[PDB]
Every structure is written in structure tokens, then in C-alpha cells.
């Protein structure tokens, strides 16, 4: 039965090790992502949560009728 239908314990042991490593890395990444999201929303110094501001290319710098702008 063991020869035909089943494999050695090494396979299950090392598959479990790999699965645990993957899941631990995913959990750490999730927590780090939450921290990064909180910091980015609080500060606004990263790529995320960059709410639009007025483009300065619209400003007309040609001389006006009034000298003091």
C-alpha cells in the first residue's frame, strides 16, 4: 500500500515548510502594506493619495493692462 498509493514523509514535511514560508511572507507583506497605506494617506508624500491640484501651465504670464498684475 505504501509503495503504490503513498510517498515518503519528506515530501509532506518540505511541502509544509514551503507553504509556511509563503504564507508568512504574505502576512508580513499585508501588514507592511497596511502601514504604508496609513502613512501615505496621513502625509501625502508618496505616489498614492495624490489628489489633483491646479496645473500651473494654465497661468498667463503675458503683460496685463494694469502694471501691478
Amino acid at each position: 500500500i505504501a509503495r503504490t498509493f503513498y510517498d515518503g514523509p519528506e515530501k509532506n514535511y518540505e511541502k509544509t515548510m514551503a507553504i509556511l514560508q509563503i504564507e508568512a511572507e504574505k502576512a508580513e507583506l499585508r501588514l507592511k502594506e497596511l502601514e504604508v497605506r496609513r502613512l501615505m494617506r496621513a502625509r501625502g508624500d508618496g505616489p498614492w493619495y495624490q489628489y489633483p491640484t491646479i496645473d500651473k501651465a494654465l497661468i498667463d504670464h503675458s503683460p496685463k493692462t494694469t502694471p501691478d498684475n
Binding site: 497596511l34 489628489y51 489633483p52 491640484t53 491646479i54
Partner: protein, 347 residues
């Protein structure tokens, strides 16, 4: 109404919505809203009768009041900032006026009565267009201005919408009123998740639009506007009743159907923001929506109501007109839970 006039009015409604969704100027956004309302009124009044006229009158009055409040908010924001670009509004009073105007347009509680009244007044196609498009546009504006929305007011209106929709749908027996109260509850969910993740708001909007389109197309196919009228459909085409039962189960949020994904993602996102009481209450209140969905499902599909004698001739004849994309709507509203991580693409 002439078919050319009908199609140009539909195109004008869509043009107004697109103008709202692509404009960067508050005046142009208001113009889009006005054009949408102006072209929408005859669409409601297409099939002339006192009920259609009354529904159109009530809808016009509500939308005109909301548009006036929205323009006042725009003017007040201009006074304190001198800006027309649609960004975070610079005055809390202007923001409150804008939020109330957009909530009135969306039908959020306590501005909800016109939604069931108009939906019962107008036909099935008019109700479908109303719900879908007229929820599509103001939510776009709200998503644009989300960063300045007052969380307390928005969540209060959302919770009121959920409760009122659940209770109204619980009491009603007319299919159009049931659909209107379901729309109110789903709008409550979406606006509740709005001040946290507009992406989740858009996801819930897409799922709700798909489910509503499928349900309204099924109702058009069955030509039933009441519960008893729907109770005869099993004797003429039981496939439609079974598909509608599955869609109703999906709309209640039962796993593993598509309707569970919006509630699941909204609960997750709102919990990320250290809010537990609100997601728990919102999840528990949806049981009313599920209850009247199940009550409708008992009458139509899971049981067999008495029939009549001319149903034999109805058997002999065949359904001529076809509503394309109905199978696609039925599939997408029931079997897209495994494809959930596409919300990043939606992002």
C-alpha cells in the same frame, strides 16, 4: 413617440451623463445634470397616463430642487475660494449643500420617497434606465469629491438608506417598488463605503448595475409588474423563474454568488479603518432585503401558484422580441465571485 425622437432623447441623457463624468468645471457639471434631467423627463412620460405624468412631475421637482441646491453650493464655494475646478471643496457649508443635493439626486434617505413613487409610476424600461443611469452620474461626482465629504453625515445618510430600503421592500408587494427599495439599500451600502474606498464604491456600483439589469430584463421578459402576475410565469416558461430565483439569491448576498463580493469587500475595507459597529449593523440589516427577496422567490419559483385557462394559448405562442445580453447579465450577476481580484484592474 417617434423612434428617432426616443433614441435622440436617450442619447441626450447619455450625453449629459458623459458631460458630467468628463467635465472639470462645476458649471459644465451642472449643465450635464440639467441636460440629463431635461432629456430624462419625456423618457419617463413616454407611455402617457396619469401615473406616468405624476411620476415625471415628482421626479422633475426633486431633481430641480437638488440642482438648485447644487448650484448654490457651487456659488458658495466660488465665493470663499474663487475656484471652478472640481476638487476638494474649500467651504464646509458648500460641501454640506453639495452632499445634500447629490444625496437627494441619488435618493438616499431621508430623500428616498420619490424613488419608489417614480419607479412604481413609470414602466419597466423607464425604471431600469432611471435606476442605472441616474445612480451612475451623481455617484461619479461624489467619488470625485470624496476627500472632503463629511464622514458623519455620509454614514448617517447611508445607514438611514439601508434601514429604510429594507423596511419598505419588506412591506411592498409591487415588483417595481421592491426594486426601488432594493436600489435604496444598495445606494446606502455604496455611499457608506464611499468615504473610504471609491474603488469599492465603483465595484459595488458595477455589481448592482449588473444585477438590476438582469432582474429588470427578466421582469420585462415575463411581462409581470406584480407578485401574482409573476406567480403565473412558472406555467409558461419555468426557465425564467429559475434564473430569477438564482438572481434574487445573488441580490441578497448569499455566497458563493456575485452579490456577496460587494458586501464582503466593503466590510473588509471599512474594518481596515477601525470601524466595526457600522459594518456589523450594515451586514445584519441586509437580512430584510434577503427576506423579501426570498418571499418573492417562494411565489415565483420554489412553489407553484394557481394558473388560468388562457395560459394554454400563451403556451401555444412564442416570445418574439429578444433582449440581447440578458444571458451575459445573468452569468455576470451570479458567477463572478472567483474573479474578485479584478478590482485592482478596476482601481
Amino acid at each position: 413617440m417617434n423612434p428617432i425622437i426616443y433614441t435622440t432623447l436617450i442619447m441626450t441623457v447619455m450625453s449629459g451623463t458623459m458631460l458630467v463624468m468628463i467635465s472639470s468645471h462645476w458649471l459644465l457639471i451642472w449643465i450635464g445634470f440639467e441636460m440629463n434631467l431635461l432629456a430624462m423627463i419625456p423618457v419617463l412620460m413616454k407611455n402617457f397616463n396619469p401615473r406616468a405624468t405624476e411620476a415625471a412631475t415628482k421626479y422633475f421637482l426633486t431633481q430641480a430642487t437638488a440642482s438648485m441646491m447644487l448650484m448654490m453650493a457651487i456659488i458658495i464655494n466660488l465665493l470663499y475660494s474663487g475656484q471652478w475646478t472640481i476638487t476638494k471643496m474649500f467651504n464646509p457649508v458648500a460641501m454640506t449643500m453639495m452632499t445634500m443635493a447629490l444625496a437627494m439626486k441619488l435618493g438616499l434617505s431621508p430623500f428616498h420617497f420619490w424613488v419608489p413613487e417614480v419607479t412604481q409610476g413609470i414602466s419597466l424600461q423607464a425604471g431600469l434606465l432611471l435606476l442605472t443611469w441616474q445612480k451612475l452620474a451623481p455617484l461619479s461626482v461624489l467619488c470625485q469629491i470624496s476627500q472632503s465629504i463629511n464622514p458623519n453625515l455620509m454614514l448617517t445618510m447611508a445607514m438611514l438608506s439601508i434601514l429604510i430600503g429594507g423596511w419598505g421592500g419588506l412591506n411592498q408587494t409591487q415588483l417595481r417598488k421592491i426594486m426601488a427599495y432594493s436600489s435604496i439599500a444598495h445606494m446606502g451600502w455604496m455611499t457608506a463605503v464611499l468615504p473610504y474606498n471609491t474603488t469599492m464604491t465603483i465595484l459595488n456600483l458595477l455589481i448592482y448595475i449588473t444585477m438590476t439589469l438582469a432582474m429588470f430584463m427578466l421582469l420585462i421578459h415575463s411581462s409581470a409588474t406584480t407578485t401574482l402576475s409573476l406567480s403565473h410565469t412558472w406555467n409558461k416558461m419555468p426557465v425564467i423563474t429559475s434564473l430569477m430565483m438564482v438572481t434574487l439569491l445573488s441580490m441578497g448576498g448569499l455566497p458563493p454568488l456575485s452579490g456577496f463580493m460587494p458586501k464582503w469587500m466593503i466590510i473588509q475595507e471599512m474594518t481596515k479603518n477601525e470601524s466595526i459597529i457600522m459594518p456589523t449593523l450594515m451586514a445584519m440589516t441586509a437580512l430584510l432585503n434577503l427576506y423579501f427577496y426570498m418571499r418573492l422567490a417562494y411565489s415565483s419559483s420554489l412553489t407553484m401558484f394557481p394558473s388560468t385557462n388562457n395560459m394554454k394559448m400563451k403556451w401555444q405562442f412564442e416570445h418574439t422580441k429578444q433582449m440581447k445580453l440578458l444571458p451575459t447579465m445573468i452569468v455576470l450577476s451570479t458567477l463572478v465571485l472567483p474573479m474578485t481580484p479584478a478590482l485592482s484592474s478596476l482601481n
